[PDB]
């Protein structure tokens, strides 16, 4: 899972 | 329209839902504010302040797809709304739309009178290396024009997240927060950059600051969930996700939007050996989990 800007 | 407006729209009734939406960004929640802006957009789709506000809100509310749809409306209605370009750069980066992200960063810079003459200047990201280079060079050129401009550094941070150059990204985002330390989006951006650059602890310190500033920042809650889960701190991950879930519904299409989060939650409950809690996620009531994870304010 990617962090969101 | 291309935007999936909530059906049962109570703000369609009120007198000044645009005023109420702006109010609810400060005093209530993102979800309620997005519903109010949705009402204005529905009744008056030529109002690009409504579309702009809807779009900005939705990104903070962990809904980039809905953010993009709204922001593209605002973009059409006012091609010079700087903040619309900025939000599109960010959401398209999140969505891995590299061409759109670079186009939105370029538009962001050149829609500003202070930088507009960069449009006429003669000037490893191998999937669009000239588009990428041009943006990078334009932002550097702008930095020589304007060296401690916080948003230039932030925008370079975006550019650098797109190309996985997380160290340069972090260094720029760090300077941005040094310039504007009460800006919750800048702390989140720095956090997201650190997390994806595999520095989850620093990231978590950045996220905490951001949430302190803006306690209804659902995207930050989700991001914290993600980092905590990554460090195998499932108690902390679970708490953050119950908060996010709770905030995200303040019903219908909104119920559906929470399902992926619920499923992520279900995995944290599984990994922590709580099949009893896992079973309860299928009902989609937060209450059992508010109690179980120490957020009893949600029972009032």
From Swiss-Prot, chain A:
A motif (Microbody targeting signal) lies at residues 3-5. It is found in: Glycosome. It comes from the Eukaryota. There are two identical genes that code for glycosomal GAPDH. Homotetramer. Belongs to the glyceraldehyde-3-phosphate dehydrogenase family. This is Glyceraldehyde-3-phosphate dehydrogenase, glycosomal. The chain holds residues 355 to 359 of 359 of the full protein.
């Amino acid at each position: 899972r990617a962090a969101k800007l | 329209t291309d935007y999936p407006f909530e059906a049962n729209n109570p703000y369609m009734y009120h007198e000044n839902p645009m005023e109420e939406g702006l109010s609810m960004l400060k005093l209530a929640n993102l979800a309620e504010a997005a519903l109010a802006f949705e009402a204005v957009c529905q009744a008056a789709p030529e109002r690009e302040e409504a579309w702009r506000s809807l779009g900005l809100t939705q990104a903070e509310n962990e809904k980039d797809g809905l953010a993009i749809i709204a922001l593209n409306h605002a973009r059409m209605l006012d091609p010079k709304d700087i903040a619309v370009h900025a939000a599109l750069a960010v959401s398209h980066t999140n969505e891995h739309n590299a061409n759109a992200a670079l186009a939105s960063l370029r538009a962001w810079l050149l829609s500003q009178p202070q930088y507009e003459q960069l449009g006429s200047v003669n000037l490893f990201f191998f999937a669009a290396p000239n588009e990428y280079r041009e943006c990078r060079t334009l932002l550097h050129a702008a930095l020589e024009m304007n060296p401690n401009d916080a948003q230039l550094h932030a925008s370079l941070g975006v550019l650098y997240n797109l190309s996985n150059n997380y160290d340069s990204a972090a260094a720029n985002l760090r300077r941005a927060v040094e310039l504007r330390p009460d800006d919750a989006q800048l702390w989140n951006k720095l956090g997201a950059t650190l997390a994806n650059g595999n520095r989850p602890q620093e990231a978590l310190d950045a996220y905490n600051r951001a949430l302190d500033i803006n306690p209804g920042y659902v995207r930050v809650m989700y991001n914290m969930a993600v980092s905590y889960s990554n460090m195998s701190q499932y108690d902390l991950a679970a708490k953050q996700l119950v908060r996010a879930i709770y905030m995200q519904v303040g019903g219908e299409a909104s119920r559906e939007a929470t399902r992926s989060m619920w499923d992520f939650f279900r995995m944290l409950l599984n990994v922590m050996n709580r099949p009893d809690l896992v079973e309860l996620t299928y009902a989609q009531n937060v209450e059992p989990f508010a109690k179980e994870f120490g957020l009893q304010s949600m029972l009032l």
